[PDB]
């Protein structure tokens, strides 16, 4: 059972004894979604972790590749041994029509396309070592998808499954903490100490190749790790009662990073992952469940009130319990920066060994790992909508904290709207000046460093203090919490540089105030269209068109782009303008003014100049010297292996392009068309009967969105790439 289609599915009028093409993207454009399904949870809870399923079975279906296509054709071994010079590679490609050169031949006895995004650095991190090995983990995870995808069939199918004990929400919110983080954090420590720590500490010089202490060892009998960082390993662990001090040895807050190749200490990662490990094991019991220990579920929240902000933040929802949509913004804005947090974090202060020096992933990664984040949040609260126009039922609220906003609309939104001039309008309206003041504007006097200076300065800030922080003040840890901040206490390694005191100033309270801007007029778009969305002060009654819903009146003299669905249809564009900015600022700091090389007489030598400082003030400086000063990489870059990035943003510029045709265009104009041609088929009897109508409005504010928004990405990943590697 059951099933199967055939016409008709969920958009009530789907079958319609057809009549027209353009159903094949009403279905492709409903299909998952609900209410154009039902909130009748006893068949919607039993979809969401159905799921939620595959995505993993897909993620598995994923990862089970990225080792088979690691460990079926290494650069891993044929390099590992030697970090430094000779670097990444996970795909080599069949000899069709001139594929070949696409698999380079530049990796240590290996033909193949070079690889950006750790992995080598992720698996020289644990240890593993041997292709026949995480190939012995390619199979570990592929059926291992199977059973998890054998859960679709587990419940639901032969088992219409349970909302009764889905709705509740206490065991799970306790157990994730404990339960299935806590199987983790520390039960990666047993791994991160015994497996990981020393097959690294003893990697950290000798141990070149093949005799590689297959993890097999170091259980039941110690002696060796014992022969290494001691601990006295009899059959009696001190710190059972406070000999803690001893079984330490190899985990005092070391901070800085491994100067015998960057990363930063694994001697500095069990103390991090058994503390933040168990908070999440203990603190993952604080709520009800059965055995009388716990807290309010919500009974906590209405705990407290405040006069204005009244009731307080009270009686916190009951679909927040129930289902998704209501909830569904928060697990995203959150998860949101929880991919901008780990970002501005990773590069920011290196994990797995071989980053700091690297590039083509102390950048690369950095991004995507900021797309997904931007993407994610900058489309998280299109879930605040739906919801109101959807999953929100009759009542639960008034005097709720909620409503306290919906009243106080118009004059909450509003007072952002102005910042969103000042902050920007004039703070971007500010490179502009120094263009009108470098072209027209004679260094004589204007906004750059030896200019609208700002002498010492800008500080430092703090950071710096971040550099008196370990020598006292938070007593120790070691070496200045992250070299990036501090004073001049300066390292690197691998000839080229690693991280250093990356000093800010003008060029720094500039730019910034743009991310500082943007993420203003990129929210409120958002908030304007998140608040009004269902009640809009100017079609006042929305829940009368749906979630998407095009516009409405040619009347009231120009009502369009009203929907949040379409408040989201440009909710994005900017993100792209904002995530697909910010990346940028990054990749001309890391580089030009962070990456290095080495020579010697006191002199680090960057990929490009300490340019930047005063040739990325002026708006322009980013085409003078951020394009045609770069791109050279990709511009020429054919007959080679940059031979894809000379091949992508091509058909990435077109397909930034072939957006506007559907996005600047009309819609009636097009339908109006698909007759004309029609005469050819018909009169000459061919013609459909799925009357070939021309793509539905929303549907084409559902392409010049994707397409624009596929377009100027790859492009910049067709681009930013090939810069890095040879002048990389």
């Amino acid at each position: 059972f059951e099933q199967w289609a055939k016409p008709g599915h969920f958009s009530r009028t789907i079958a319609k004894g057809p009549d027209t093409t353009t159903w094949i993207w009403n279905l492709h454009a409903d299909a998952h979604d609900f209410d154009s399904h039902t909130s009748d949870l006893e068949e919607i809870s039993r979809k969401v972790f159905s799921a939620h399923f595959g995505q993993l079975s897909i993620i598995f279906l994923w990862l089970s590749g990225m080792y088979f296509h690691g460990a079926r054709f290494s650069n891993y071994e044929a390099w590992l041994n030697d970090p430094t010079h000779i670097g990444p590679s996970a795909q080599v490609v069949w000899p069709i029509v001139g594929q070949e050169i696409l698999n380079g031949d530049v990796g240590g006895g290996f033909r193949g396309i070079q690889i950006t995004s750790g992995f080598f650095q992720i698996w020289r991190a644990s240890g593993i070592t041997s292709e026949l090995q995480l190939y012995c983990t390619a199979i570990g995870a592929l059926v291992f998808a199977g059973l998890m995808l054998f859960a679709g069939w587990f419940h639901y199918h032969k088992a219409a499954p349970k909302l009764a004990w889905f709705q509740d929400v206490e065991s799970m919110l306790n157990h994730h903490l404990a339960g299935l983080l806590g199987l983790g954090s520390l039960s990666w420590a047993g791994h991160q100490v015994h497996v990981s720590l020393p097959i690294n500490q003893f990697l950290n010089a000798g141990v070149d190749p093949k005799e590689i202490p297959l993890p097999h060892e170091f259980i039941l009998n110690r002696d060796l790790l014992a022969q290494l960082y001691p601990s006295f390993a009899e059959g009696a662990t001190p710190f059972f009662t406070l000999n803690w001090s001893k079984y330490a040895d190899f985990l005092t807050f070391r901070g800085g990073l491994d100067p015998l190749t960057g990363g930063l200490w694994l001697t500095d990662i069990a103390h991090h992952h058994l503390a933040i490990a168990i908070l999440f094991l203990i603190a993952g019991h604080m709520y009800r469940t059965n055995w009388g220990i716990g807290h309010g579920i919500k009974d906590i929240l209405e705990a407290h009130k405040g006069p204005f902000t009244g009731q307080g933040h009270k009686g916190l929802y009951e679909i927040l319990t129930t289902s998704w949509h209501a909830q569904l913004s928060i697990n995203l804005a959150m998860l949101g920066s929880l991919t901008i947090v780990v970002a501005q974090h990773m590069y920011s202060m290196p994990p797995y060994p071989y980053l700091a020096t690297d590039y083509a992933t102390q950048l690369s990664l950095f991004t995507h790992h900021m797309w997904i984040g931007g993407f994610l949040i900058v489309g998280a609260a299109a879930h605040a909508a739906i919801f109101m126009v959807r999953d929100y039922d009759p009542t639960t609220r008034y005097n709720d904290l909620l409503d306290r906003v919906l009243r106080h609309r118009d004059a909450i939104i509003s007072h952002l709207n102005w910042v969103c001039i000042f902050l920007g309008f004039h703070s971007f309206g500010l490179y502009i000046h120094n263009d009108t003041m470098s072209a027209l504007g004679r260094p004589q006097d204007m906004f750059s460093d030896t200019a609208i200076q700002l002498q010492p300065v800008f500080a430092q800030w703090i950071q710096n203090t971040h550099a008196l922080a370990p020598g006292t003040t938070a007593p120790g840890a070691t070496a200045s919490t992250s070299l990036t901040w501090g004073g001049g206490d300066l390292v690197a390694v691998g000839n080229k540089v690693a991280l250093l005191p990356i000093p800010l100033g003008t060029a720094d309270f500039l730019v910034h105030h743009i991310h500082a801007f943007t993420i203003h007029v990129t929210v409120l778009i958002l908030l304007k269209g998140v608040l009004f969305a269902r009640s809009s002060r100017l079609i006042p009654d929305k829940a009368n068109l749906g979630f998407r819903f095009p516009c409405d009146g040619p009347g009231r003299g120009g009502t369009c782009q009203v929907s949040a669905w379409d408040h989201v249809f440009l909710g994005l564009f900017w993100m792209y303008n904002s995530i697909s900015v910010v990346i940028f600022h990054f990749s001309w700091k890391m580089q030009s003014d962070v990456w290095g090389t080495i020579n010697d007489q006191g002199v680090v030598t960057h990929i490009t100049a300490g340019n930047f400082a005063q040739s990325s003030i002026t708006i322009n400086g980013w085409l003078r010297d951020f394009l045609w000063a770069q791109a050279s990489q990709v511009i020429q870059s054919y007959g080679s292996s940059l031979s894809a990035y000379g091949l992508f943003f091509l058909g990435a510029h077109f397909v930034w392009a072939f957006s506007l045709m559907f996005l600047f265009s009309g819609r009636g104009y097009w339908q109006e068309l698909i007759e004309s041609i029609v005469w050819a088929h018909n009169k000459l009897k061919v013609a459909p009967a799925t009357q070939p109508r021309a793509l539905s409005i929303v549907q084409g504010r559902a392409v010049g969105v994707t397409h624009y928004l596929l377009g100027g990405i790859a492009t910049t990943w067709a681009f930013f790439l090939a810069r890095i590697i040879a002048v990389g």
Binding site: L538, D552, G553, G555, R556
Partner: protein, 80 residues
């Protein structure tokens, strides 16, 4: 000030023009269709190219649009 011109047959409703926002709706009795009903606007001065007035309103060839030229604080909508 509502435009341009818009045309016969439907009503009753129970499956057509039941939803102008700003009124603009009587129904005279008049003789022709399958019981008695001819219409556009006992009005058009409260409306507003609320042009949802044929979406609910079939009957063949252009059937509702706007043309406000003058375009009026009555139906350009902007109160405050």
């Amino acid at each position: 000030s509502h435009s341009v011109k818009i045309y016969d047959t439907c009503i009753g409703c129970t499956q057509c023009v039941r939803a102008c926002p700003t009124d603009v709706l009587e129904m005279i009795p008049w003789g022709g269709c399958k019981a008695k009903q001819i219409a556009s606007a006992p009005r058009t001065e409260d409306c507003v190219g609320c042009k949802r007035c044929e979406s609910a309103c079939p009957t063949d060839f252009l059937s509702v649009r706007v043309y406000l030229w003058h375009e009026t604080t009555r139906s350009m909508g902007l109160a405050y």
